[PDB]
């Protein structure tokens, strides 16, 4: 087995060994809650009067009534977009040549703001960064400043070329994921040395299946408020069985987990300096 012990300290020693060259991050809503974007699991959607609560993120319903979704986006639109310590931890992985890919479930663009490039990212459920007119014969593209303005004005966004609906480039429940997700997944996991899984409950599919694509020897560290990804005793990650050999669960806040790992790697000062400098720049802008 590659880890000398099933602890964060074991993971950190492995990351600074010659074997650990290619890291894939798998991240979800938990990495952005400290930036002010709420997840869905942690313990506000009644004003919308939907047939069933989860219809607001389903494509069948959005197509029939896009108003509730845009009204929700307005309510959730953050005053500033400040990536978290966890985001900047992944920026450090990129800076140090360790990041093969960040697969993200999030649509909030904070990975881009933190300095991950398009090539580093698989935005598996799309993004608010770009939007497109929904008419197949048009597909005119619009930037966030255009979309934010229509969300705030409480005016459903319409294409200026054809007056069809303009939809953020996000993947609703019931929509196909982007081709890039499947293409990257079929190559990235051939030689990955570490999976870093953060801020996800591993319940949305097919994203959740990504953890099963690494080689059987690849260590997998989960940094998450709750243990996730274990097989269901009714219906994976093996942290606690007598057969456990490569999966480690660090239970707590993503920011605190990344800080603790950074400190073991000797990156604590680098990470603090980076976050403070980036946040100060965003404040100045």
């Amino acid at each position: 087995r590659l880890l000398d012990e099933l602890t964060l300290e074991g993971v950190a020693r492995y990351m600074q060994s010659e074997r650990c060259r290619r890291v894939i991050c798998l991240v979800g809503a938990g990495i952005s809650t400290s930036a002010g974007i709420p997840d869905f699991r942690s313990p506000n959607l009644e004003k919308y009067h939907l047939p069933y609560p989860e219809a607001i993120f389903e494509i069948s319903y959005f197509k029939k009534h896009p108003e509730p979704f845009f009204a929700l986006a307005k309510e959730l639109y953050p005053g500033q977009f400040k990536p978290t310590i966890c985001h900047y931890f992944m920026r450090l992985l990129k800076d140090k040549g360790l990041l093969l890919r960040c697969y993200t479930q999030n649509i909030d663009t904070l990975e881009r703001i933190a300095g991950l490039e398009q090539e580093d990212l698989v935005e598996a459920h799309g993004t608010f960064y770009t939007s497109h007119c929904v008419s197949a014969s048009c597909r005119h593209e619009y930037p966030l400043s255009w979309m934010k303005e229509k969300i705030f004005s409480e005016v459903t966004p319409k294409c200026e070329d054809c007056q069809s609906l303009v939809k953020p480039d996000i993947v609703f429940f019931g929509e196909s994921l982007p081709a890039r997700f499947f293409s990257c997944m079929q190559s990235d996991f051939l030689k990955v040395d570490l999976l870093l899984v953060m801020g996800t409950s591993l319940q949305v599919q097919p994203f959740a299946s990504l953890i099963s694509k690494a080689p059987l020897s690849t260590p997998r560290l989960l940094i998450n408020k709750e243990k996730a990804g274990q097989s269901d005793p009714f219906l994976g990650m093996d942290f606690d069985s007598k057969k456990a050999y490569r999966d480690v669960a660090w239970l707590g806040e993503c920011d605190q987990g990344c800080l603790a790992l950074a400190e073991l790697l000797g990156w604590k000062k680098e990470l603090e300096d980076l976050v403070r400098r980036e946040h100060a720049s965003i404040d100045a802008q």
Partner: peptide, 6 residues
Amino acid sequence: LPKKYG
């Protein structure tokens, strides 16, 4: 392509 579910 496979659809988002769950």
